[PDB]
Structures are given as C-alpha cells and as structure tokens.
Amino acid sequence: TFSEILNRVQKAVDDLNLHSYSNLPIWVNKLDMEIERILGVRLQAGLRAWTQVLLGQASHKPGGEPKIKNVVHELRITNQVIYLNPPIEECRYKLYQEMFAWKMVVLSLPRIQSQRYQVGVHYELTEEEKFYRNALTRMPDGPVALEESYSAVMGIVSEVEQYVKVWLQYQCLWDMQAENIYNRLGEDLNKWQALLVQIRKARGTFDNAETKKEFGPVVIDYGKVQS
Amino acid sequence: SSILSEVSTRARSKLPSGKNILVFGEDGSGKTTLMTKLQGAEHGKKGRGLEYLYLSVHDEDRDDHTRCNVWILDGDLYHKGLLKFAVSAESLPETLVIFVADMSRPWTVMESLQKWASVLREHIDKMKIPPEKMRELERKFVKDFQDYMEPLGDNVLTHNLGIPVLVVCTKCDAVSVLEKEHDYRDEHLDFIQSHLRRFCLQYGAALIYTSVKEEKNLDLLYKYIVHKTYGFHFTTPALVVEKDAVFIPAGWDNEKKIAILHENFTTVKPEDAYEDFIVKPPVRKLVHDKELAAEDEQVFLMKQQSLLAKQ
C-alpha cells in the first residue's frame, strides 16, 4: 500500500514535470521532507506496535498488524547432553530479522524525487537517498522506540535463556556421583530432610501436561527430553 | 537452596563462552560484508542500528562447538544510545572491540577512528564501572600486552580501555585502484600505516589489513579473533614484510619499528596533521538550482509607485 501510494504520487509529480513550472525540484524536496516526517511518525507507531506484539501485552491503525513467526527451539538429548537444536543465540538472531523486517516494509520505500526529468543530477542514485533510509532519524519520539524495541528483545531472550538455563541444570542426572551428595549430607536433620524437599519443588518445569513452553514468539519445546 | 549448590558443583569439562565481540565503524564501510564472510555466509543483510551475528567457533583440536556474539553497530552517531545494549559490566570483561576502516576512503579514517575513541570511552564510563575492576582489567591487559613473544614506553597504551582491541581495515584491494586513479603515493600508504600503528599502540591494538574481494587475511582474522577471545593456539608471525597486507600482533609494535617505517618516507614529516598530508576527495554532486522566487505584489507595487512618482 505504501508502495502504491508513493508511486502514484511519483506519477503525478512526473505529470507536473511534463509542464513548465519553475522551482519544481525544490518543491519536490520540500514534499519529500514532509513525506519523511509523516512516514517517520508512521514508522514509530509501527515499531511501537511491534514492541507490544513481541512483549505479549498487545483498519488503518497507526501501528498496523505486527506478526512474528514462531521461533521454535528444541531440547535435544543426544550424546547424553542437553542440546539446543537452534542454539540460544538463534532465539535472538531470528527476532532481530523479524524486527528488521518490520522496518524495511516501511523503510525500503522509494523516495519521491524530481529526477524523472531533472536528469541534471547525472549520477547513479545513491542508496541512502534512492531508498529513503533516513526515517529513523525522523523519530517523533526520538530514538526511544528503538530503545524500547531492543529492550523487549533484550528481556525476551535474556530471561528465556534463564529458562533454558534451568533445564540445563538437570545435566547432573547422567553425570554425577551420589557418593558426593551422601558425604556432603551424611547425618543431616536425619539424612537429608532438606534437599529431599527442594527436589520435589524442582520437579517443576517438568512433570506437567505442557509439552512445549511458549513465550511470546519463542517456543522452547521439551519434547525429546520429556520422558 | 541446597540443590543449586549440589548440582552446580558437579561441573564437567567445558569451553568458555558468552563473549560479546563488538564492531563499531563508519557507516557503509562494508562492515557487514566482512563480518558475514568471516562468519561463513557470503553476506547477510544490512539495516539500521545494532545487528546480531552469532559467530560459530569450532575447535577441532578439542572438537567442540561454541558461539560468540558479533554485535555490529551502525555508524550513525544518532544510533549511539543503543550501544548501551551492546556492552554490560557483566559482559565487559570479555568483550573484544574492532573498527572497520574502509581503506577505499582513507580521508575519513582517523576521524572515524577517533570517533570510536570517544564513543566507547563515554559508554565505558557512563556505565559507572567501579574503579577497582576497571584498574584490574586494565593492568591484566597491560601485562598480556607486555609478554608478547612470537614492552614499555611513554605512550604505550597511553589511553586504552583495558579490553582487547583490533583495527581491521577492509577493502584492501581498493588500494590498487586509488593508487592509479588518485596517483596515491606509496609514501602516503607508509604514512597512514605509521599513523595507524601509532594509534593502535596508544590503544594497545592489533591491526590487520583485509580485502573480502581478495579474501586476504580472512583466515588470519579468524585465527587471531579466536586466539584473543578464547585463548586458542596461535602461530602466525608478525606479517609486516609487505605493504600490500600487514598483520601486527598486539605487542609486536614498537616505536622503533615505527621509526623504521618513518625512515623510508621523506616527503612530509609524519608529525604534521593527518588530513594535511592526505588529499581531500572533492564533492561531485552540484548544488541544487537557486530558488526562482517571484517578487510579491506588495513590494512590486511600491516599486511601481516609485516608478510612477518619478514620472
């Protein structure tokens, strides 16, 4: 839709150029700056909506309709070690691309330009002008939106890695000498009387009908390890 | 509770991870191209602001798989606050930072480089690292610098942030073209190499030329990067012999090894300002045509009032 609106505007501008009116390029430039501010505000709204959708608290709503593909991860048990089929770093990388996606859809727009007949700039159109890559600096709210966006990801990944961390702690069940525990807690309250209690609580994140823990667009699936 | 002790103490063999390798460079310096080609893909996608590349390091000698975090930063200063996402004091002790001086534009190197010198510096203090840890990291890096074997001085590490630092300069092949197209003197190459060596010395940095087009030192880049962030075995000597591609290990550089480079150029003394020696690239795009404003009715009418009155 942005593409069709802009190219229609470009056709109308070319039609203006068909006739002879003075100071056309400067008028085109002022129009471009106005477009820049308007689209920057729209970009800020869209980024805000993207942050809301990612963070989970979320016909021409300014933000739009963000949609992030579910990033699937698996706890692989092969080689008697808890693997991440996509490594935890993936859980961030993919999100970034998604976030990147939600920008190009509004950032890769062709810039309205008078060069259609103003061939006086006989030079290959530079990328940072031909594609209108200045929107982020036209933030109505300042860079705060970006500060928010990454923050969400920074949260979403970080703590969910913590979740993964909890799962990884179970590694000991295959490589751990019970003699160590016995010596450490020989003759406790009676024998352990404490860790035999916290183990029951440790049965959390586990022994539940849930098979894959969803969290926003990141789903960590403990399917292979469940049994 | 008791578990998180008992289970945790049962630790097995492993390899250190969670390293945040950082990249700052002047925008459009092909930094993404370098980082991707180093990672293995020819080139990912660009964008704005921070980007993430999980660099996959495999040690065949121990046969293990680990991932470091290439955190490539956009060059626009307005995107500097998001650098607070890049480095945290939890991540700081193990962060390795590099610059990408696109040698196809020497005119902007030191400026851009010095821009680094400001930005990171501010960010490393705006986070209020306690002086004890900053000092201990600083001295640890100093000792690591001093014990090079394939030093001391007045300006050695005279201003450094105590974390390993490189200066990788890409598009090395371009030096050929700008040599012929710009009549760029070889003495200019020696001068910029000397000035960069001085900078990397005062920051205790290891400089490496590279050219993705010539896939030159890319293996060497990977080798050094792993050797620094992890501590793998290193064996490549101080490749400084030819000016086409030079590798300076962090510690190899000596002020006398810079004096010898001083000797071979005798056109203009190195002490002069950087931009003075190098030739500025003139702007090509023409200024847009001046506004053809039309005299409005009011002052035109008073002028005509004068014209009639004179009659």
Side-chain angles (χ1 to χ4, degrees):
Chain A
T1 52
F2 283 153
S3 67
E4 76 186 5
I5 299 278
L6 269 294
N7 60 51
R8 189 158 73 233
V9 168
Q10 186 60 89
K11 302 302 298 315
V13 173
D14 200 302
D15 180 58
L16 269 186
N17 210 316
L18 294 176
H19 312 160
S20 300
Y21 317 121
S22 285
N23 299 318
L24 181 62
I26 186 167
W27 163 256
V28 170
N29 288 305
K30 171 176 172 291
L31 198 54
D32 203 3
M33 311 335 297
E34 183 59 24
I35 291 304
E36 168 150 349
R37 195 205 65 232
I38 286 296
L39 193 152
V41 172
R42 280 303 301 286
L43 192 154
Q44 191 275 292
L47 203 75
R48 190 64 42 101
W50 196 87
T51 57
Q52 276 288 351
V53 169
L54 172 67
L55 211 68
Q57 288 80 17
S59 67
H60 292 171
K61 330 292 308 175
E65 207 280 324
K67 187 57 61 55
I68 299 93
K69 182 174 73 69
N70 296 115
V71 193
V72 179
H73 280 53
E74 154 186 352
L75 288 199
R76 193 167 299 284
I77 196 59
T78 190
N79 206 3
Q80 53 93 34
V81 172
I82 297 293
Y83 285 165
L84 268 299
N85 194 4
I88 178 64
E89 298 89 328
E90 214 63 49
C91 277
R92 195 175 292 152
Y93 177 27
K94 293 209 190 176
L95 294 182
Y96 276 14
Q97 300 302 112
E98 286 268 12
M99 182 305 298
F100 269 116
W102 203 244
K103 292 193 306 174
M104 283 74 74
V105 63
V106 76
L107 192 46
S108 66
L109 274 297
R111 218 172 196 177
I112 180 65
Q113 62 183 356
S114 174
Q115 193 270 332
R116 297 284 74 78
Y117 180 71
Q118 195 266 328
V119 178
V121 188
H122 182 240
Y123 153 66
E124 169 52 61
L125 275 297
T126 186
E127 199 279 306
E128 298 284 349
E129 187 275 331
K130 195 216 311 178
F131 287 98
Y132 176 103
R133 266 186 47 114
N134 201 6
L136 277 299
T137 72
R138 209 64 53 176
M139 269 301 138
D141 203 5
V144 179
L146 265 296
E147 316 278 352
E148 186 175 1
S149 67
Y150 282 137
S151 84
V153 173
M154 162 46 48
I156 293 286
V157 163
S158 69
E159 64 92 28
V160 74
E161 174 268 353
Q162 186 59 256
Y163 181 92
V164 177
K165 162 70 211 64
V166 160
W167 261 106
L168 265 295
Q169 203 73 0
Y170 291 64
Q171 190 55 249
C172 77
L173 273 297
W174 297 263
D175 50 356
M176 161 295 288
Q177 284 72 6
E179 173 73 11
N180 190 5
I181 291 276
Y182 301 164
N183 299 140
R184 287 184 184 178
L185 277 297
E187 191 62 27
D188 207 4
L189 296 94
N190 195 339
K191 189 44 185 184
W192 293 271
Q193 182 54 256
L195 65 92
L196 192 142
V197 192
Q198 293 87 19
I199 288 302
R200 178 165 267 276
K201 296 183 290 294
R203 264 177 56 197
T205 76
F206 172 75
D207 202 1
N208 52 2
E210 281 270 43
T211 66
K212 51 150 184 54
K213 179 250 177 175
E214 181 269 353
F215 182 76
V218 171
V219 287
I220 171 170
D221 189 359
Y222 46 102
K224 306 318 169 72
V225 299
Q226 175 63 261
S227 163
Chain B
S1 60
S2 61
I3 309 178
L4 303 102
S5 69
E6 306 293 289
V7 54
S8 51
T9 58
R10 305 300 314 182
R12 296 295 91 194
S13 177
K14 65 178 72 66
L15 187 139
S17 182
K19 314 271 176 292
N20 220 41
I21 182 169
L22 195 141
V23 172
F24 163 74
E26 188 67 27
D27 49 351
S29 311
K31 45 176 75 173
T32 42
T33 311
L34 176 62
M35 281 305 78
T36 49
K37 169 68 213 61
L38 188 44
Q39 191 273 331
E42 55 93 21
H43 166 45
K45 81 162 281 289
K46 291 165 179 280
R48 314 282 295 156
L50 183 63
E51 315 194 359
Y52 193 121
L53 275 299
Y54 64 95
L55 182 65
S56 52
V57 174
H58 161 61
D59 49 341
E60 78 293 338
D61 53 356
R62 308 213 321 158
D63 262 359
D64 198 298
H65 190 182
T66 311
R67 279 81 62 196
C68 186
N69 306 123
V70 164
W71 269 20
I72 190 167
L73 166 72
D74 181 16
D76 202 343
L77 279 299
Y78 163 72
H79 295 287
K80 88 175 70 58
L82 61 88
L83 188 69
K84 79 181 191 299
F85 280 82
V87 174
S88 303
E90 301 81 4
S91 63
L92 176 60
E94 60 276 13
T95 45
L96 175 139
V97 294
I98 61 181
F99 184 78
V100 292
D102 192 354
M103 321 176 58
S104 58
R105 189 60 269 157
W107 182 257
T108 66
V109 167
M110 289 306 197
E111 196 158 3
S112 45
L113 192 58
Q114 294 285 358
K115 187 183 294 180
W116 181 359
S118 295
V119 164
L120 198 58
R121 179 64 245 191
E122 284 157 295
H123 170 92
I124 196 66
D125 58 66
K126 291 308 284 282
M127 71 166 319
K128 275 83 71 179
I129 184 71
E132 54 274 43
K133 294 183 289 294
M134 183 278 288
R135 188 267 181 194
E136 69 183 359
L137 306 176
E138 179 63 276
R139 58 92 180 171
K140 181 174 72 68
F141 180 65
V142 163
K143 273 75 175 176
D144 294 328
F145 183 80
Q146 291 212 341
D147 54 48
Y148 181 47
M149 186 66 204
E150 210 287 323
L152 73 164
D154 72 319
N155 51 0
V156 61
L157 277 77
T158 190
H159 181 237
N160 68 306
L161 302 197
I163 57 174
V165 172
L166 310 180
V167 179
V168 299
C169 46
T170 184
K171 203 63 181 181
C172 171
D173 52 302
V175 301
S176 176
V177 176
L178 62 94
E179 163 64 80
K180 50 190 182 183
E181 82 182 356
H182 291 346
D183 203 57
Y184 214 78
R185 296 325 301 127
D186 292 331
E187 318 297 329
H188 304 184
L189 290 176
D190 285 319
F191 168 75
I192 69 183
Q193 181 200 350
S194 56
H195 206 189
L196 275 184
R197 280 193 64 186
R198 287 195 300 279
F199 179 96
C200 79
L201 189 145
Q202 65 209 68
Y203 263 120
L207 189 153
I208 303 95
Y209 299 80
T210 187
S211 175
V212 175
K213 313 296 298 179
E214 211 75 5
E215 56 258 53
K216 199 189 288 184
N217 311 274
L218 290 188
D219 45 356
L220 166 57
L221 281 172
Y222 201 108
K223 184 184 171 56
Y224 202 81
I225 281 163
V226 181
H227 171 80
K228 276 307 180 54
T229 188
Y230 293 159
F232 282 28
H233 172 65
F234 201 92
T235 188
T236 306
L239 180 64
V240 300
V241 291
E242 83 263 12
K243 65 181 312 185
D244 213 356
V246 176
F247 166 68
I248 300 90
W252 167 230
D253 210 318
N254 300 300
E255 319 178 6
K256 322 304 170 184
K257 307 299 184 292
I258 308 170
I260 183 167
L261 184 55
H262 283 131
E263 284 304 318
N264 44 287
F265 69 85
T266 56
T267 70
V268 174
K269 310 316 289 172
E271 64 156 359
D272 290 330
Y274 172 77
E275 285 78 359
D276 291 357
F277 190 82
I278 297 89
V279 180
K280 186 257 185 162
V283 57
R284 166 193 175 175
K285 290 189 299 182
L286 60 84
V287 60
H288 79 267
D289 49 351
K290 64 179 293 297
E291 166 64 27
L292 192 73
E295 169 153 355
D296 62 351
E297 70 276 17
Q298 189 60 257
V299 73
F300 183 95
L301 263 56
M302 60 195 87
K303 202 178 98 72
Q304 292 295 344
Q305 263 274 350
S306 68
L307 294 150
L308 290 160
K310 298 149 201 151
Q311 180 181 4

Short mmCIF file of all heavy atoms in Angstrom, two decimals, chain A residues 6-26:
data_model
loop_
_atom_site.label_atom_id
_atom_site.label_comp_id
_atom_site.label_asym_id
_atom_site.label_seq_id
_atom_site.Cartn_x
_atom_site.Cartn_y
_atom_site.Cartn_z
N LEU A 6 3.01 5.83 -2.95
CA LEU A 6 4.19 6.60 -3.34
C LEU A 6 4.38 6.62 -4.85
O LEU A 6 4.74 7.65 -5.41
CB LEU A 6 5.43 6.08 -2.64
CG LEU A 6 5.74 6.73 -1.30
CD1 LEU A 6 6.09 8.19 -1.52
CD2 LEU A 6 4.58 6.62 -0.33
N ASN A 7 4.16 5.49 -5.52
CA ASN A 7 4.38 5.51 -6.96
C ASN A 7 3.28 6.28 -7.69
O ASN A 7 3.55 6.90 -8.71
CB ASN A 7 4.51 4.09 -7.52
CG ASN A 7 3.28 3.25 -7.28
OD1 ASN A 7 2.16 3.65 -7.59
ND2 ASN A 7 3.49 2.05 -6.75
N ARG A 8 2.06 6.27 -7.16
CA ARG A 8 1.03 7.15 -7.71
C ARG A 8 1.44 8.61 -7.55
O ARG A 8 1.30 9.41 -8.49
CB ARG A 8 -0.30 6.90 -7.02
CG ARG A 8 -1.46 7.60 -7.66
CD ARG A 8 -2.76 6.92 -7.30
NE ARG A 8 -3.12 7.17 -5.92
CZ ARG A 8 -3.42 6.22 -5.04
NH1 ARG A 8 -3.36 4.94 -5.36
NH2 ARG A 8 -3.78 6.56 -3.81
N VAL A 9 1.96 8.96 -6.38
CA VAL A 9 2.45 10.32 -6.16
C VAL A 9 3.58 10.63 -7.13
O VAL A 9 3.67 11.74 -7.66
CB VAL A 9 2.87 10.49 -4.70
CG1 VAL A 9 3.65 11.78 -4.53
CG2 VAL A 9 1.66 10.48 -3.80
N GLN A 10 4.45 9.65 -7.38
CA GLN A 10 5.54 9.85 -8.31
C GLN A 10 5.03 10.10 -9.72
O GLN A 10 5.57 10.94 -10.45
CB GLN A 10 6.48 8.64 -8.29
CG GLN A 10 7.74 8.80 -9.13
CD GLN A 10 8.60 9.97 -8.70
OE1 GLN A 10 9.47 9.84 -7.85
NE2 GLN A 10 8.37 11.13 -9.31
N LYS A 11 4.00 9.37 -10.13
CA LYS A 11 3.41 9.60 -11.44
C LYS A 11 2.83 11.00 -11.53
O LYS A 11 3.01 11.69 -12.54
CB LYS A 11 2.34 8.55 -11.73
CG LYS A 11 2.84 7.13 -11.68
CD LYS A 11 3.98 6.91 -12.66
CE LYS A 11 3.51 7.14 -14.09
NZ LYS A 11 2.21 6.46 -14.33
N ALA A 12 2.14 11.44 -10.48
CA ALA A 12 1.60 12.79 -10.50
C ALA A 12 2.71 13.84 -10.55
O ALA A 12 2.58 14.86 -11.23
CB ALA A 12 0.70 13.01 -9.29
N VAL A 13 3.80 13.60 -9.84
CA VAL A 13 4.93 14.52 -9.87
C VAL A 13 5.54 14.58 -11.26
O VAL A 13 5.89 15.65 -11.76
CB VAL A 13 5.97 14.13 -8.81
CG1 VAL A 13 7.20 14.99 -8.95
CG2 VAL A 13 5.38 14.30 -7.43
N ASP A 14 5.70 13.42 -11.90
CA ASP A 14 6.18 13.41 -13.27
C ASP A 14 5.25 14.19 -14.19
O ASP A 14 5.70 14.94 -15.06
CB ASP A 14 6.33 11.97 -13.76
CG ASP A 14 7.25 11.86 -14.95
OD1 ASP A 14 6.98 12.52 -15.98
OD2 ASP A 14 8.24 11.11 -14.87
N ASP A 15 3.94 14.03 -13.99
CA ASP A 15 2.98 14.78 -14.78
C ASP A 15 3.17 16.28 -14.56
O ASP A 15 3.08 17.06 -15.51
CB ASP A 15 1.56 14.36 -14.42
CG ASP A 15 0.52 15.12 -15.20
OD1 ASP A 15 0.56 15.06 -16.45
OD2 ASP A 15 -0.34 15.77 -14.58
N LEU A 16 3.41 16.68 -13.32
CA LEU A 16 3.75 18.08 -13.06
C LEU A 16 4.97 18.49 -13.86
O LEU A 16 5.01 19.58 -14.44
CB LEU A 16 4.00 18.29 -11.57
CG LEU A 16 2.78 18.68 -10.75
CD1 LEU A 16 3.21 18.99 -9.33
CD2 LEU A 16 2.09 19.86 -11.38
N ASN A 17 5.98 17.62 -13.90
CA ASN A 17 7.19 17.91 -14.65
C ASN A 17 6.94 17.99 -16.14
O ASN A 17 7.75 18.57 -16.87
CB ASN A 17 8.25 16.86 -14.35
CG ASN A 17 9.66 17.40 -14.45
OD1 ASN A 17 9.98 18.15 -15.37
ND2 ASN A 17 10.51 17.03 -13.50
N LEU A 18 5.85 17.39 -16.63
CA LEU A 18 5.56 17.46 -18.06
C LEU A 18 5.38 18.90 -18.51
O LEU A 18 5.84 19.27 -19.60
CB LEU A 18 4.31 16.64 -18.37
CG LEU A 18 4.45 15.14 -18.15
CD1 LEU A 18 3.13 14.43 -18.39
CD2 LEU A 18 5.54 14.57 -19.04
N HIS A 19 4.73 19.72 -17.70
CA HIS A 19 4.55 21.13 -18.00
C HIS A 19 5.82 21.88 -17.59
O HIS A 19 6.87 21.28 -17.34
CB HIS A 19 3.32 21.66 -17.30
CG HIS A 19 2.11 20.80 -17.48
ND1 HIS A 19 1.02 20.87 -16.64
CD2 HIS A 19 1.81 19.86 -18.41
CE1 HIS A 19 0.11 20.00 -17.04
NE2 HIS A 19 0.56 19.38 -18.11
N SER A 20 5.73 23.20 -17.52
CA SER A 20 6.88 24.04 -17.20
C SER A 20 6.52 24.98 -16.06
O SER A 20 5.92 26.04 -16.27
CB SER A 20 7.34 24.81 -18.43
OG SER A 20 7.70 23.92 -19.47
N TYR A 21 6.89 24.60 -14.84
CA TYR A 21 6.74 25.45 -13.67
C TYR A 21 8.09 25.57 -12.99
O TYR A 21 8.80 24.58 -12.84
CB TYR A 21 5.72 24.87 -12.70
CG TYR A 21 4.50 24.34 -13.40
CD1 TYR A 21 4.13 23.01 -13.26
CD2 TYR A 21 3.72 25.16 -14.19
CE1 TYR A 21 3.01 22.52 -13.89
CE2 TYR A 21 2.60 24.68 -14.83
CZ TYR A 21 2.25 23.36 -14.67
OH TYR A 21 1.13 22.86 -15.31
N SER A 22 8.44 26.79 -12.60
CA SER A 22 9.77 26.99 -12.05
C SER A 22 9.85 26.48 -10.62
O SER A 22 8.83 26.28 -9.95
CB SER A 22 10.15 28.47 -12.11
OG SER A 22 10.47 28.86 -13.43
N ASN A 23 11.08 26.26 -10.17
CA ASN A 23 11.35 25.81 -8.81
C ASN A 23 10.69 24.47 -8.52
O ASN A 23 10.30 24.19 -7.38
CB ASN A 23 10.90 26.85 -7.78
CG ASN A 23 11.61 28.17 -7.95
OD1 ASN A 23 12.82 28.21 -8.18
ND2 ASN A 23 10.86 29.26 -7.84
N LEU A 24 10.55 23.62 -9.53
CA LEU A 24 9.98 22.30 -9.29
C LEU A 24 10.83 21.44 -8.38
O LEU A 24 10.28 20.86 -7.43
CB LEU A 24 9.71 21.60 -10.62
CG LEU A 24 9.09 20.22 -10.44
CD1 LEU A 24 7.74 20.35 -9.76
CD2 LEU A 24 8.95 19.51 -11.77
N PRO A 25 12.15 21.30 -8.59
CA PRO A 25 12.91 20.40 -7.72
C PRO A 25 12.87 20.78 -6.25
O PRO A 25 12.81 19.89 -5.39
CB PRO A 25 14.33 20.49 -8.28
CG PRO A 25 14.14 20.90 -9.68
CD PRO A 25 12.99 21.84 -9.66
N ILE A 26 12.90 22.07 -5.93
CA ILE A 26 12.89 22.46 -4.53
C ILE A 26 11.53 22.15 -3.90
O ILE A 26 11.45 21.73 -2.74
CB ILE A 26 13.27 23.94 -4.38
CG1 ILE A 26 13.41 24.31 -2.91
CG2 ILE A 26 12.27 24.84 -5.06
CD1 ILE A 26 14.07 25.64 -2.68
#
